Design a binder for these strands. Structure first.
Ligand SMILES: [Mg+2]
Ligand SMILES: [Mg+2]
Ligand SMILES: [Mg+2]
Ligand SMILES: [Mg+2]
Ligand SMILES: [Mg+2]
Ligand SMILES: [Mg+2]
Ligand SMILES: [Mg+2]
Ligand SMILES: [Mg+2]
Ligand SMILES: [Mg+2]
Ligand SMILES: [Mg+2]
Ligand SMILES: [Mg+2]
Ligand SMILES: [Mg+2]
Ligand SMILES: [Mg+2]
Ligand SMILES: [Mg+2]
Ligand SMILES: [Mg+2]
Ligand SMILES: [Mg+2]
Ligand SMILES: [Mg+2]
Ligand SMILES: [Mg+2]
Ligand SMILES: [Mg+2]
Ligand SMILES: [Zn+2]
Lengths: 81, 155, 99, 118, 60, 25, 127
RNA sequence: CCGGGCACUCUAACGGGACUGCCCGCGAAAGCGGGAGGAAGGAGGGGACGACGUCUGGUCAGCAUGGCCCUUACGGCCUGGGCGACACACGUGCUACAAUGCCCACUACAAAGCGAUGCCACCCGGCAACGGGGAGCUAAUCGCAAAAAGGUGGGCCCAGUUCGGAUUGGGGUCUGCAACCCGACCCCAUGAAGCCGGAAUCGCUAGUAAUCGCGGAUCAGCCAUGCCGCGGUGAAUACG
């Protein structure tokens, strides 16, 4: 963890701060899973990348301190049998 | 011991009672190379052989050892036919070693919580003859009893 | 009050250097107290012997820095000039200071 | 006598017998002992109902404990699951949450082994 | 290793974390002694021919 | 034992320092 | 004014100064029994005293460093052994059969690659 | 610490020293036993050292290199992922199951190595990781450093426990562009299996085995319990 910190990539932090004061909001795809989320992210739909594709994740307020990659899982399982 | 008669390690005599057989016993209480613990345990035993018993604890030791010393045991020999159990008497050297060993091994089986009391009481009970370590001695001589049948195969 | 610090990877030449500076000083001037070996500082490398995988079977090497100290109390301008021009070192290193 | 929830410790020591409560131990014990100014080497068996009430009333009040604690750790986990997050899946599927390695022994969190053929 | 790899190891900038020792004989990333800038195979190779100054094989 | 990081033995073994093995001499 | 000996066991080194008196012994500026307090074998450090019969004839000034408490002790033993044999070196008479004049060559054997502790070997597998 | 000496310890170069060379016994000799030597014997202990060859052994992924093969790609750059997956199965290990033990306090004794792009004394802030400050050292000259077991004192009283610390919740620290996947560390909480392990099976002959700590290489940091080393204490047992 960090504190003097709270790292977020400027790529989407741009387009998010932008989708606040535009008045309009829609579907935004980032490769940044290292970043942290919120507060102005909430209500937005971001497509994170698992290495394979961009997965839509709806953003709500208890998703807060979490990196984006937490909601975009990298592996595929479904068990053995 | 292919070539050699594999001669015996000579032990430096004790500091306090001044005896080889003590040290040889001390070493056998020694877990993981701690001698301090070994002797501080052993010596505390004689502290217990005193206020408890009136005799002179070294003398207990030399006796409880002599009581626990197996006179004959049964080892094995491969012959035309099966592998057997043949009675032979234990060498003087071996008597000692076996005795020292059982002494401790029985000792650490007794329930009394502290180390030095276990060796106290076992060395007492051994001396007086009713020791668990002595059970083993008898029980070994007893195996040499049963197989006195095959006693003609001895080397 | 001027002290010379000697280093090098070979003690056969190192000592053979510190020996020359002794009479590039002693005979050549004021008193200079004899060669004192400092402890040797040893870099060591222990490495796997073959290119692929045999993880036991390591060869190891070392690089040894040997140090030799010699002190000089009183300056003579023949000692100094000797210690400047008359240098005959090779793979040996040398230092000096006023302090 | 009994502190938060029921949780009766007894005999033994006092500062030890405090561990036996859910939410407390080692540190939190040796703490409330001098902040109610009670001897820790005393045995909960004997002591004034006075030092007993000072003791209960402090602990029960300072921090949350067995009932509400368990339910609070409970609720955190629930939140981690169902938010959809990755720490949440590993709670959902009963698997280890913090890095480590599931190709081999996860046993504590996987259960006993359930063997299969080759 | 490959060329673009032995190369890219020298173009060091962008986030100085990415820089990594690579051996200056091979191109070999793994087991590269800091002192020599040689990988473990080369250091055994050069040490043996007396081309490593004051470097002798030890024993004790 | 050497695996309890909350004791002197643990901390030493792990090589670290803290409230249970404070640095002093 | 005094007598001297050198001894070492296993990286431990001992300097032994023997001057006559009550028999007071000093180790590293400490009474023998404070420094070595509570150690079984301590009194075996000076055997050759009792063995040569000088009891309360000599005080002792001893410095010691290197190794560890218990190897230092056998190093001091060789000090007394060698010091005592300076004063009237007829003391060779009964010292050497007691063995007190020999140094213990026994030290830590090193560690060997592919082994674990230098003899101790990694567990065999076969499968 | 100062004067002062280096005598000793030591430091690190150079020689010395044991050769079955001496005595008795055997013996045809070579050797073998035994003796007294001496610090040391019967190659003193430990290295480095590995014959002609063997396994069509290992490695085209260190490198080199014949042949075959790809050529807007089988080459090249990037962002992210994966090598860290988990019903399970095996190898090598660390930590244990406790009272010759655990905890706290006080108190001792090492060696080998590393460090002025680093090692960091000492003071302050913080329970702490750590963060402020900040002197010394190109280093037998300052630092890493506390060695640990041990010792003394006190506590625990045989209990799944002051045993054991896996798991999980919360709170933070540091490196790093960045610690979701995948970091190490500190604190609070949580305290799992485990009460000496079926058939089976490994190591070790002496300063060894056990046991206790310490350094280094790689390295930003680190999954090191690994490896290569260092010394502390220190057994048992070999008829055959
Ligand atoms: Mg190439
Ligand atoms: Mg790197
Ligand atoms: Mg590298
Ligand atoms: Mg514990
Ligand atoms: Mg030495
Ligand atoms: Mg060792
Ligand atoms: Mg291995
Ligand atoms: Mg040869
Ligand atoms: Mg083949
Ligand atoms: Mg990439
Ligand atoms: Mg792998
Ligand atoms: Mg994993
Ligand atoms: Mg391991
Ligand atoms: Mg159970
Ligand atoms: Mg991760
Ligand atoms: Mg039990
Ligand atoms: Mg087992
Ligand atoms: Mg590192
Ligand atoms: Mg280590
Ligand atoms: Zn290379």
């Amino acid at each position: 963890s960090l504190k003097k910190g709270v790292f977020v990539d400027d790529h989407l932090l741009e387009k998010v701060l932008e989708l606040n004061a535009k008045g309009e909001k829609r579907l935004i795809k980032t490769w940044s899973r290292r970043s942290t989320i919120v507060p102005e992210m909430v209500g937005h739909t971001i497509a994170v990348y698992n290495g394979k594709q961009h997965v839509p994740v709806y953003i709500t307020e208890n998703m807060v301190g979490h990196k984006l990659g937490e909601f975009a899982p990298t592996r595929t399982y479904r068990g053995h049998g | 011991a292919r070539r050699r008669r594999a001669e015996v390690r000579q032990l430096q005599p004790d500091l306090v009672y001044g005896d080889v057989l003590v040290t040889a016993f001390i070493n056998k209480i020694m877990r993981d190379g701690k001698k301090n613990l070994a002797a501080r345990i052993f010596y505390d035993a004689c502290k217990i052989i005193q206020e408890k018993t009136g005799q002179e604890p070294l003398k207990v030791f030399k006796q409880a050892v002599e009581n626990v010393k197996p006179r004959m045991e049964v080892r094995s020999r491969r012959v035309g036919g099966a592998n057997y159990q043949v009675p032979m008497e234990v060498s003087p050297r071996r008597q000692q070693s076996l005795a020292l060993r059982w002494l401790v091994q029985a000792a650490n089986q007794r329930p009394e919580r502290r180390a030095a009391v276990r060796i106290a009481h076992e060395l007492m009970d051994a001396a007086e003859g009713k020791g668990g370590a002595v059970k083993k001695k008898e029980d070994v001589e007893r195996m040499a009893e049963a197989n006195r049948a095959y006693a003609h195969y001895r080397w | 009050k001027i002290r010379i610090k000697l280093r090098g990877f070979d003690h056969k030449t190192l000592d053979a250097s510190a020996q020359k500076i002794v009479e590039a000083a002693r005979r050549s001037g004021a008193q200079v107290s004899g060669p004192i070996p400092l402890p040797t500082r040893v870099r060591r490398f222990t490495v796997i012997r073959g290119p692929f995988k045999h993880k036991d079977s390591r060869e190891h090497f070392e690089l040894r820095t040997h140090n030799r100290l010699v002190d000089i109390i009183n300056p003579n301008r023949k000692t100094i000039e000797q210690l400047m021009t008359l240098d005959l070192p090779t793979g040996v290193e040398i230092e000096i200071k006023t302090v | 006598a009994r502190i938060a929830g029921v949780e009766i410790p007894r005999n033994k020591r006092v500062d030890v017998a405090l561990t036996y409560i859910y939410g407390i131990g080692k540190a939190r014990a040796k703490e409330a002992l001098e902040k109610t100014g009670i001897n820790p080497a005393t045995r909960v068996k004997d002591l004034t109902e006075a030092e007993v009430v000072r003791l209960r009333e402090y602990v029960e009040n300072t921090w949350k404990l067995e009932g509400e604690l368990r339910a609070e750790v409970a609720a955190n986990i629930k939140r981690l699951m169902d938010i959809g997050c990755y720490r949440g899946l590993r709670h959902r599927r009963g698997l280890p949450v913090r890095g480590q390695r599931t190709r081999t022994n996860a046993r504590t969190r996987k259960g006993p082994r359930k063997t299969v053929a080759a | 290793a490959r060329k673009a790899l032995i190369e890219k190891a020298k173009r060091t900038p962008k986030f100085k974390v990415r820089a990594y020792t690579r051996c200056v004989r091979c191109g070999r990333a793994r087991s590269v002694y800091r002192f020599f800038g040689l990988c473990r195979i080369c250091l055994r190779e050069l040490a043996h021919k007396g081309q490593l100054p004051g470097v002798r094989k030890a024993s004790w | 034992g050497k695996g309890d990081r909350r004791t002197r033995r643990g901390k030493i073994w792990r090589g670290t320092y803290g409230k249970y093995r404070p640095r002093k001499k | 004014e005094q007598y001297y000996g050198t001894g070492r066991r296993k990286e431990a080194v001992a300097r032994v100064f023997l001057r006559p008196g009550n028999g007071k012994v000093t180790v590293n500026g400490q009474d023998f029994n404070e420094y070595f307090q509570g150690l079984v074998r301590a009194v075996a450090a000076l055997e050759p005293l009792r063995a040569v019969d000088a009891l309360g004839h000599f005080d002792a000034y001893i410095t010691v460093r290197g190794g560890g408490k218990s190897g230092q002790i056998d190093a001091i033993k060789l000090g007394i052994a060698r010091a005592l044999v300076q004063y009237n070196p007829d003391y060779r008479a009964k010292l050497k059969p007691l063995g007190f004049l020999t140094r213990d060559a026994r030290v830590v054997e090193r560690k060997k690659y592919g082994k674990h502790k230098a003899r101790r070997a990694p567990q065999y597998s076969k499968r």
